[PDB]
Amino acid sequence: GPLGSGRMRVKAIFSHAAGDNSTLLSFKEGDLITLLVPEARDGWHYGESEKTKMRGWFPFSYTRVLD
Numbered sequence: 001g002p003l004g005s006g007r008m009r010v011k012a013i014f015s016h017a018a019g020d021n022s023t024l025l026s027f028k029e030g031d032l033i034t035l036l037v038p039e040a041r042d043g044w045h046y047g048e049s050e051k052t053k054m055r056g057w058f059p060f061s062y063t064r065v066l067d
């Protein structure tokens with residue numbers, strides 16, 4: 001597809017706090033996250049916060065897929 005297409009985003013419907021751990025992504029409810037891998041692994045997805053531009057793994061269950 002055209003370069004830049006295929007983006008998938010989710011909306012945080014619960015907040016998630018990484019703590020002192022750069023592998024995990026923090027976000028507040030309402031933040032949008034662009035997925036950067038094709039599937040969740042063991043219930044964890046990986047993406048980038050629209051608000052903070054940080055990246056990391058998070059519980060997929062804390063979000064819902066935007067359509």
Ligand SMILES: O=C(O)CN(CCN(CC(=O)O)CC(=O)O)CC(=O)O
Pocket residue numbers: 011065066067
């Ligand atoms: O529709 C809204 O008011 C805001 N939507 C924008 C995108 N919507 C559009 C819609 O529902 O008509 C799709 C979605 O929430 O998946 C985001 C949200 O609920 O936080």
